[PDB]
Design a protein around this ligand. Structure first.
Ligand SMILES: O=c1ccc2ccc(O)cc2o1
Ligand SMILES: [Ca+2]
Ligand SMILES: [Ca+2]
Lengths: 432, 430
């Protein structure tokens, strides 16, 4: 089963919004170094044709979201990114065609059949500055298709890319005007204070080292593995944790704790290596003043819980989950402004969180269904980037009743983790 | 506070009535552009779990109420919305929790996590998922039912028939008592020769690129005010001893609020402003609409005046203007309102700027929606886009009563002051 690029149309906006070269600068969250990647993910649709439908809504959306056709480039003074927009810039659209039906591969929900990685362009992050937003429409012989997207993480976070794709989707459904107007103005809203000040909750977590590439660690060839998890086992687990800890845990707390411990123990981490649990959270509604409705840049700070690997692999789950619960306490206006002010002081010092960072990303209850171009919402959605949140092994929560846990793991540790998930799938949680 | 979403159950109909996919046409009342919005409200209950009971009665209801599963699309021949119904479609039921006791949060009267108690889709997103229910549990055994419904599919009394049919099944009804009737393009269709009377022509205008819900007035805040039967009596009686006329609460209080609203917004003296509300016309048509008809069976009634005259003329004149607005409610008024939609849907029908809408929820049987935990103790609307207005106002039921007003940020400081003089009995009636 072989995929085949046919041709690559270069869609400019419908009616040009730019006269001359506007150069937009990016916020101090956009210039995070862990965001100097390209996020690759795809959506699968079942059931006038998808190519022209996507390229039409894209052309019209690019009157408002015109910076997605820009060119990222580093700056003369600071090493920060700035985005170059002009008239004639285009977002490439790849058309592809794989010679099987997608029902034969289970709508790509199960194991990889070989070509999933070619279902969205894979630029190494420097050709991902020239074209920081790339779309692809692969057509299957079934009567069904896939929509891949390679967007540079500095331009937009998850919710920002959601606004853009909801704009394309509604336009394809006959909407007369985009429901929410994009707002840029990122150096105003998310900028550093005049006297930069950083509090303990940020300093206790970040370190400086110009020589540390968080994505360059030699931990081996990393693999992608999905796992189904039922609402039955979660309630089984939340209740046992309740009998012991006297506290009620969210799914993200309790399932995050169990996966963290199973990951660090399977990777045989030294008993006294500092390890970290890291996740993004939206702060748009939390700044004072709150961020505007159409802010589509990065509006998320990373939050952390840290511990020794020895303590993690041996202490009860309900102390680890309690630790993860204590981490979302730090979320505040001062945390974000301290994080921004730390970027202003040490952006060229190589900010990082260290080794043994495991990233967790909850995507279950994004509005995936409303990304509808006329073939229904996506049957399945899949992220491919294993470089995320300063981590090389990021874990995704994805949409007989439960959700899909996607983990990225070093090949050396996948066998024991597959086992630790089967014990979960059997209620043998070994809480201590 | 902390609200978690635990799962989302996609509840399909029990005995799936569709083999063929079915496109259902909506009526010209349904396709009023002022109804292309998602209406969000919640019910709070007190004292075989509410999640399981609601979903079980939801599924059986959807055998007769299957259009609530389908999608809203713009037809090929025109912009007009058609309802795509097919086998396999479902209604999402978000399941959620919060670590409060419901009594801890002053149930839900005293006014901060309510905007999460129900999803908030945009108007286009709302066409993909028109009917979204959400059951949220609180510690001290009690729960909240959230609903986001696209207004093109049904009106107030229409979501009442659907929920009362959910309520009667959850109690143990063997079948549903009233079959729901569609028959929509036949019942509320246009006349072969469209004719539009002056009572409708004087209220609306044509403008392709006017958006009633995208006006640039700033950000709209939401606030409640308790209004006593004490002060209303003193208001109707001082209007009586000054005009000799009798005024209902909806005419006297709605005129005090309309005036204070327009006062606070610093509206230019010669701008036309409007007072709007909907009335059920099911019993007013010749022939009447069936009892099961659950689509939109209401037309907006309007009352208009210059801003400067409204802000300085006596209250009893403004309350008379509203009293006289219900004179226009007839059968031809509805047939004219429909024929106007037939003539000018593509030309952007609207009632212009300055529109303050009002909705009166006090005297509608909110109790009978009983799933097993009694009637809802409180009920709260969350939308602020309604009846072509971005600053709607609600009269909430008897637990005096609470008036819920949506008003732009900059006008709220003087509206609080206005309502504070209403509470003291300083009505300043001219
Ligand atoms: O104005 C209203 C009041 C209640 C209501 C309830 C459901 C609905 O779909 C629309 C509605 O509009
Ligand atoms: Ca440090
Ligand atoms: Ca006066």
């Amino acid at each position: 089963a072989t995929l085949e690029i046919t041709d690559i149309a270069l869609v400019q906006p419908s009616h040009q919004p730019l006269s001359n070269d506007q150069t937009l600068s990016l916020s101090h969250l956009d210039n995070d170094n862990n965001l100097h990647v390209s996020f690759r993910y795809l959506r699968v649709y079942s059931s006038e044709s998808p190519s022209a439908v996507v390229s039409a809504s894209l052309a019209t959306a690019l009157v408002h979201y015109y910076p997605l056709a820009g060119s990222l480039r580093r700056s003369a003074s600071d090493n920060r990114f700035e985005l170059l927009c002009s008239a004639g810039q285009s977002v490439p659209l790849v058309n592809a065609t794989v010679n099987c039906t997608l029902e034969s591969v289970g709508y790509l929900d199960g194991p990889d059949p070989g070509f999933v990685e070619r279902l969205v362009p894979d630029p190494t992050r420097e050709e991902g500055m020239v074209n920081p937003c790339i779309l692809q429409v692969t057509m299957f012989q079934c009567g069904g298709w896939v929509l891949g997207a390679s967007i540079h993480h500095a331009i937009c976070d998850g919710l920002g890319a959601s606004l853009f794709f909801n704009a394309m989707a509604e336009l394809a459904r006959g909407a007369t005007k985009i429901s929410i107007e994009p707002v840029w103005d990122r150096e105003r809203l998310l900028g550093p204070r005049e006297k930069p000040w950083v509090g303990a909750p940020v300093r206790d977590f970040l370190s400086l080292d110009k020589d540390f590439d968080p994505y360059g660690q030699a931990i081996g060839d990393v693999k992608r593995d999905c796992f189904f998890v039922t609402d039955d086992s979660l309630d089984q687990l939340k209740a046992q944790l309740l009998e012991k800890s006297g506290l009620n845990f969210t799914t993200f707390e309790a399932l995050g704790a169990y996966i963290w411990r199973a990951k660090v123990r399977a990777a045989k981490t030294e008993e006294k290596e500092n390890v970290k649990f890291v996740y993004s959270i939206n702060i748009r509604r939390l700044m004072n003043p709150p961020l505007p409705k159409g802010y589509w840049g990065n509006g998320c700070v990373p939050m952390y819980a840290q511990i020794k690997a020895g303590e993690l692999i041996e202490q009860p789950i309900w102390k680890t989950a309690e630790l993860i619960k204590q981490s979302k306490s730090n979320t505040s206006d001062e945390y974000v402004r301290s994080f921004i002010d730390f970027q202003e002081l040490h952006h060229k010092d190589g900010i990082n969180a260290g080794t043994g960072v495991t990233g967790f990303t909850d995507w279950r209850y994004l509005g995936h269904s409303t990304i509808d171009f006329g073939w229904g919402g996506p049957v399945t959605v899949l992220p491919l980037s294993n470089k995320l949140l300063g981590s090389m092994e990021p874990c995704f929560f994805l949409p007989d009743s439960g959700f899909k846990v996607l983990v990225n793991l070093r090949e050396s540790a996948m066998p024991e983790f597959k086992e630790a998930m089967d014990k979960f799938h059997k209620g043998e949680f070994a809480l201590s």
